[PDB]
Every structure is written in structure tokens, then in C-alpha cells.
Paper text:
Two plasmid-encoded dihydrofolate reductase (DHFR) isoforms, DfrA1 and [name], that give rise to high levels of resistance in Gram-negative bacteria were structurally and biochemically characterized to reveal the mechanism of TMP resistance and to support phylogenic groupings for drug development against antibiotic resistant pathogens. TMP is a selective inhibitor of bacterial dihydrofolate reductase (DHFR), which catalyzes the NADPH-dependent reduction of dihydrofolate (DHF) to tetrahydrofolate (THF), a necessary step for the recycling of reduced folate cofactors. Expectedly, all three enzymes form the stereotypical DHFR fold with an eight-stranded β-sheet, four α-helices (B, C, E, and F) and three catalytic loops (the Met20, F-G, and G-H loops).
Here, the diaminopyrimidine ring of TMP forms interactions with Glu28 (corresponding to Asp27 in EcDHFR); however, the trimethoxyphenyl moiety is oriented horizontally in the pocket, and key van der Waals contacts are lost through the L28Q substitution. Overlay of the EcDHFR:NADPH:TMP and [name]:NADPH:TMP structures shows the D27E substitution lays the foundation for the divergent binding orientation of TMP. The additional methylene unit in the side chain of glutamic acid results in a 1.4 Å reorientation of the carboxylate head group, subsequently pulling TMP further into the active site by 1.1 Å. Variations in the GH loop likely enhance the positioning of TMP deeper in the active site of [name] compared to EcDHFR. Although distal to the active site, the GH loop makes critical contacts with helix B (residues 25–35) and is four residues shorter in [name]. Despite co-crystallization and soaking efforts, no density was observed for NADPH in the DfrA1:TMP structure, while in the [name]:TMP crystal structure the adenosine and phosphate moiety occupy their expected binding sites.
Residue numbers in the entry:
A (entry chain B), B (entry chain A): 1 to 157
Write the structure that this text describes.
Amino acid sequence: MKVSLMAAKAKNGVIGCGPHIPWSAKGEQLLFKALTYNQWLLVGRKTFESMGALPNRKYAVVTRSAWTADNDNVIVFPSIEEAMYGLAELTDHVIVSGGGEIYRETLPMASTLHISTIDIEPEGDVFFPNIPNTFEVVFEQHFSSNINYCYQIWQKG
Amino acid sequence: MKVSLMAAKAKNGVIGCGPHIPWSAKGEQLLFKALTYNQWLLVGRKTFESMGALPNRKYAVVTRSAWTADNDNVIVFPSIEEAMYGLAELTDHVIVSGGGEIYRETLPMASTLHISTIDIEPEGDVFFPNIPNTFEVVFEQHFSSNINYCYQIWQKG
Ligand SMILES: COc1cc(Cc2cnc(N)nc2N)cc(OC)c1OC
Ligand SMILES: COc1cc(Cc2cnc(N)nc2N)cc(OC)c1OC
């Protein structure tokens, strides 16, 4: 199965200040809605709880705890390893859609990054990992909004 | 300024049966909405009338008549050269968003294509031109829907 990764980070690499995103870049989330439509996503438990489920997406949620989910559209996995083995029988394609921890543990398995950088440098204590130079930008487009943002697609070369 | 082009075509190349699109693929238009967000779009006058202005988007519309719009978000030009010269004072980027005529006229200026191919072969007045080998696919993603669709980004090689 193909592993993609989709994130939005500030220019200082912040993705998270506790359970919040410390910015609202009007329009950016349309990109996430476009590329996740009828896809399978892999999310950490904290990101899943803070951001909720959208319709027309399936979720693999990883926890080390006894946490569970009423949603029929969700499968809980005890590890990333297990989620990958599971997903591989359920889909051609999974989009890793966050957690700091999840991004750190999955970035090496990804063949395509969808990265949005927001024109702000806010307070924060979760950070996107460093992008290995095995990856190259193949597409980029700037957006003007309340806070500008840059969308880039990276492929593993 | 960089010229992109964004289109959605059936597998047989149909983009239009008169002023309608002969199909509705749930999900696909999210990609159009996310990539045109707060961008300048170049549209022919026929497409503009049949499909209407969207909010949060700027329009360069070309006519060979004295046709005009009812919208301070719209600039009418008598030619594509005039539209380009005018836009270049306002923006580093324009997305050509159709007409069959417009696509044919502008494909030679475009350095990035955003092409959605819908899994259907309907009847069609209007067709997307053939993609010259001057361009190469740099990204691709498949979507399952009521009608499946494939999204590809082509760059000028
Ligand atoms: C996993 O849950 C969501 C996460 C995000 C964050 C996010 C926002 N933008 C981009 N490009 N990638 C992301 N991962 C955004 C969301 O909706 C806009 C989510 O709703 C399901
Ligand atoms: C020119 O305005 C629109 C055009 C289209 C057709 C279209 C649909 N999908 C893609 N990817 N590109 C397109 N050009 C679709 C639209 O709405 C979903 C438009 O907004 C009114």
C-alpha cells in the first residue's frame, strides 16, 4: 500500500500547543478535505480526539492505552506496526494525518508528503520532524489569506 | 507570472455537453475548490455564465464582444494577452479554469496542469485537448466514489 503523510506546520515547525492549532489559516483545510476524501487516515489518539471524525473517511487510531471509539468508521490499533499490517489488507493507500509522535514514527515509510506551511511563528510544544533530503518538492503553490500558507508536495527520490 | 491550468475530463476527454458537465463525481470538486482558493482564475465568457462566480476567488474573463459582468471581483479583457498583462500587475499566479476554447488557447503558456479524469465515457459537444509530451506527471492519487476519479499534477519538463 502507498503511505502518504499530510500536515500543516507554522514556519517555526509548530503543529500543536496542547490540544489546539495556534493559528487559523482560512482555506488551508480545504486541501486536507480534498486529498482525504474517501481515504483511510492513520492518526494518533490525541489528534483524533482533538480534531474529530469527518464523513467519507476511515480512521486507524493508535493508542498504548485501553481507549476505544464508538464510530464504525474507526479501527483502534495497539501500535503503528499493527495499524500498517491491518491497513495493508484494507486499502491500496493510507494518509498519515498527524500526531507529532505519529509523524516522527511514520515519515520514513512515506513515499509522498503533503506539507502546508503557515506564515506565522507561534508559541507551541509539538513540532513536525526534520524532512530527510531523500525527499524532493515536485509541486508548490502560495495562497494569500488572513495568514498566508504555502502547499508543497514532496516525493521520496 | 506562472500559469497553471485546472480541468476535469471523462476518460474519453469529454468536458462538456453544451453548458452542462454530463456527470457528477462526489469528492472531485473539493480539489478545484482547494487549489483555486483566493487565486486569480482565467475563464472564457461561456464557462463563466454557465458555472457562475464562486466566493473567495478573483476572475479574469475574456470576451470578443462588449459583454461585461455585475461583479467588482471580475475583470473583463478583450484578449488573453491583455488579461495576462493586466493580471501580471496584480498576481504572480493565474489558474486557467476553462472553456474548451480557452484550454486549447492557453495550454502552450501553462507550466503546471491539475487534471482530474473521471471513470466515465459520456456523450459530448466539448473535449479537453491532448496533453503534449512537453509535460510529465509528478503526482497522482486515485479516489473511489459514485464515479471513481484520478487526480494528476503535470509539470512542464
Ligand atoms: C485528523 O483530523 C484532522 C486534522 C487536520 C489537520 C491538518 C490540516 N491541514 C493539513 N494539510 N493536514 C492536516 N493534517 C485537519 C482536519 O480537518 C480540517 C482534521 O479533521 C478530521
Ligand atoms: C470555472 O468554475 C468552475 C469549474 C468547474 C469545472 C472543474 C472541475 N474540477 C476541476 N478539477 N477543474 C474544473 N475546471 C467546477 C466548478 O465548481 C465545482 C467551478 O466553479 C463554479
